Amino acid sequence: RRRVRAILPYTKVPDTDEISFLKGDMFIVHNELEDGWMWVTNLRTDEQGLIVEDLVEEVG
Ligand SMILES: [Cl-]
């Protein structure tokens, strides 16, 4: 469980558990699979869903 920040914007694929986001959006990473899929909470929108880890950076 950690925070990550979007380094790019993203528009979700319709009728999926993906969420949209903007560059700079902060997320709580609840869980992550080996293939890069994360279940997160977007802290700006309070939406939960799927994101790919290559669109985010570790928060230090
Ligand atoms: Cl949708």
Side-chain angles (χ1 to χ4, degrees), residues 12-16:
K12 68 163 285 157
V13 167
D15 259 52
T16 70

Side-chain angles (χ1 to χ4, degrees), residues 1-55:
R1 185 193 163 106
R2 60 204 180 96
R3 285 179 306 141
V4 293
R5 184 186 294 108
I7 56 165
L8 283 172
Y10 183 74
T11 297
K12 68 163 285 157
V13 167
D15 259 52
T16 70
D17 287 337
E18 297 180 2
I19 54 160
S20 292
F21 53 88
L22 301 168
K23 184 185 182 305
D25 283 358
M26 190 78 80
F27 309 85
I28 299 159
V29 183
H30 302 286
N31 292 281
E32 184 178 1
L33 305 181
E34 276 83 315
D35 70 344
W37 280 112
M38 298 165 153
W39 187 276
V40 301
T41 298
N42 184 316
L43 294 170
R44 182 183 48 88
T45 63
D46 291 301
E47 286 169 20
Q48 282 196 36
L50 298 166
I51 75 174
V52 188
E53 71 154 301
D54 48 55
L55 298 175

